[PDB]
Amino acid sequence: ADVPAGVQLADKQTLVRNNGSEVQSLDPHKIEGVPESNVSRDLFEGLLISDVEGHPSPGVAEKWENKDFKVWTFHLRENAKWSDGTPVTAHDFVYSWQRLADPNTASPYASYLQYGHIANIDDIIAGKKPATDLGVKALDDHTFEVTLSEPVPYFYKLLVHPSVSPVPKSAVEKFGDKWTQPANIVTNGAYKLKNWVVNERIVLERNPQYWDNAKTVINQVTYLPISSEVTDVNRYRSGEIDMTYNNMPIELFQKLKKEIPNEVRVDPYLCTYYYEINNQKAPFNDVRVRTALKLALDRDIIVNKVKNQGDLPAYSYTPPYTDGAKLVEPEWFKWSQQKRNEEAKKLLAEAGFTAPLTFDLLYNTSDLHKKLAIAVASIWKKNLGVNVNLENQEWKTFLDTRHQGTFDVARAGWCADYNEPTSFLNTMLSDSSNNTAHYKSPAFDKLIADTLKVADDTQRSELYAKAEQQLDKDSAIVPVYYYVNARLVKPWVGGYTGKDPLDNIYVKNLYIIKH
Numbered sequence: 001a002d003v004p005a006g007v008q009l010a011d012k013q014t015l016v017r018n019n020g021s022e023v024q025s026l027d028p029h030k031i032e033g034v035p036e037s038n039v040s041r042d043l044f045e046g047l048l049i050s051d052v053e054g055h056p057s058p059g060v061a062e063k064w065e066n067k068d069f070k071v072w073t074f075h076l077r078e079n080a081k082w083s084d085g086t087p088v089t090a091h092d093f094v095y096s097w098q099r100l101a102d103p104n105t106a107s108p109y110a111s112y113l114q115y116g117h118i119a120n121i122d123d124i125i126a127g128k129k130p131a132t133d134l135g136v137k138a139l140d141d142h143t144f145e146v147t148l149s150e151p152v153p154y155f156y157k158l159l160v161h162p163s164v165s166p167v168p169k170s171a172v173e174k175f176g177d178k179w180t181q182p183a184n185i186v187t188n189g190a191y192k193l194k195n196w197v198v199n200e201r202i203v204l205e206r207n208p209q210y211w212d213n214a215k216t217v218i219n220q221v222t223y224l225p226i227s228s229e230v231t232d233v234n235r236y237r238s239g240e241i242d243m244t245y246n247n248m249p250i251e252l253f254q255k256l257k258k259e260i261p262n263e264v265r266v267d268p269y270l271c272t273y274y275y276e277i278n279n280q281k282a283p284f285n286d287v288r289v290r291t292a293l294k295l296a297l298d299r300d301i302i303v304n305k306v307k308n309q310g311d312l313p314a315y316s317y318t319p320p321y322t323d324g325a326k327l328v329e330p331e332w333f334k335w336s337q338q339k340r341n342e343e344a345k346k347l348l349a350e351a352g353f354t355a356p357l358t359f360d361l362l363y364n365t366s367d368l369h370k371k372l373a374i375a376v377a378s379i380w381k382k383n384l385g386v387n388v389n390l391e392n393q394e395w396k397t398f399l400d401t402r403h404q405g406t407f408d409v410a411r412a413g414w415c416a417d418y419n420e421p422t423s424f425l426n427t428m429l430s431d432s433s434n435n436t437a438h439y440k441s442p443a444f445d446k447l448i449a450d451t452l453k454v455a456d457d458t459q460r461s462e463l464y465a466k467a468e469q470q471l472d473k474d475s476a477i478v479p480v481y482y483y484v485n486a487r488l489v490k491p492w493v494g495g496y497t498g499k500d501p502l503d504n505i506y507v508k509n510l511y512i513i514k515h
Helices: 034-043 092-102 119-127 169-178 228-236 253-259 287-297 299-305 339-350 367-384 395-406 423-430 442-453 457-473
Strands: 013-017 047-052 056-058 059-066 069-077 136-140 143-147 191-197 199-207 221-222 264-277 358-364 388-395 407-414 475-486
Touching: 013 228, 034 191, 034 199, 034 221, 056 059, 069 092, 092 119, 092 136, 092 143, 092 169, 228 367, 264 287, 287 339, 287 367, 287 475, 299 367, 299 475, 339 367, 358 367, 358 395, 367 388, 367 407, 388 395, 395 407, 407 475, 423 442, 423 457, 442 457
Parallel strands: 013 221, 358 388, 358 407
Antiparallel strands: 047 056, 059 069, 069 143, 136 143, 191 199, 199 221, 264 407, 264 475
């Protein structure tokens, strides 16, 4: 943390945060969500971290070099330590990325190393070679070398993600799946796990082995798993919580805006809200059915009349304000709603539905989502005659259901892991481990794979625009809105600028002002 000369630090340095729901796990190779990542960044540190404005900065690596953006060399700081006082070395990385890549780990983010194009990743994912063949190696105890099969100029931006954080071999091998309990867990980020009471709370305390421990200010942090947005704002307003989760209730939002405007933080967020369709299940394997759903949803109504929190109406997967994006708005988005509706009733009738398509719409337990689900079910009923049945599951189960394919249409949100369009686009590759839409298009795949062979960034951005158009002509998903990051932060929380579009908060960077 960097307390501005002049301010007064509270006597007690503690912070309570709402995390939106119970984490899937705390093992870095088993998580995929925003809540899990929030906790993960306070416990595990990889080569690079983001600074307070979102820029990639030195983490365990102190310096790194590249040869043609193809061979990356990371020089780890000599004092990096695990909470057990043992040293973090490059072997910890080698082992770690080997475990992520390995099919027996079954990480939902196994594909992250195909996103970075580490040599031999495909064959390893496919079982043709063993994980030990991955293009990574410790040159010495402090130099970690990565070999990519293609130059990836943005490779260092991917490395702030939790999946590429190191995990401690000794604990993993002893304790297996139980290595993450308070008893056995071993960490290397600014914090270490104090307690973990499921459906109750996660409490972390400063880690004395941490290399930047001298700058760390907050001593204890509690992460709450509250999935009700009304309760989060209420317990905040009662003084029990310092920073809510960043999902605001439709209900009390404009209210709060009038009573406590400077506690209402609203910033650009690189996330898209959409209805994910299971592209493999009849009748959603028909493009006419997918397109009719896409067209008949009225975004003006959802974004400007039922949510009204500043979100922008969406026509693409990748948010147009992503660095490097240059998207074309499709025709359909320029029509009026009535014209989209006419066109949607004709594609359905052509696919054999009249007076009706019936299907389930799944959401994760939440006051916000339930509200938009009912609103969308009524809009699709009214505009298209489709009957929807609503289903709700808890966070963990919801994620498992989408990976497994046992849903029709699900409410979804994807946030960038690094600010570059492949952070979105790579999740639609046929073999991606994050492809919960189950979309498979050889034309899409080839557009993305060509992006690593162009010579220039301009060429690169034109293939990103054509990939978004290929996804839109397939109507793989139903784009709803590009998010704003809205949460409530108490006046006495310092360090949180809110200017990072990825929202990569580190508790080590915050500090409680005297109050």
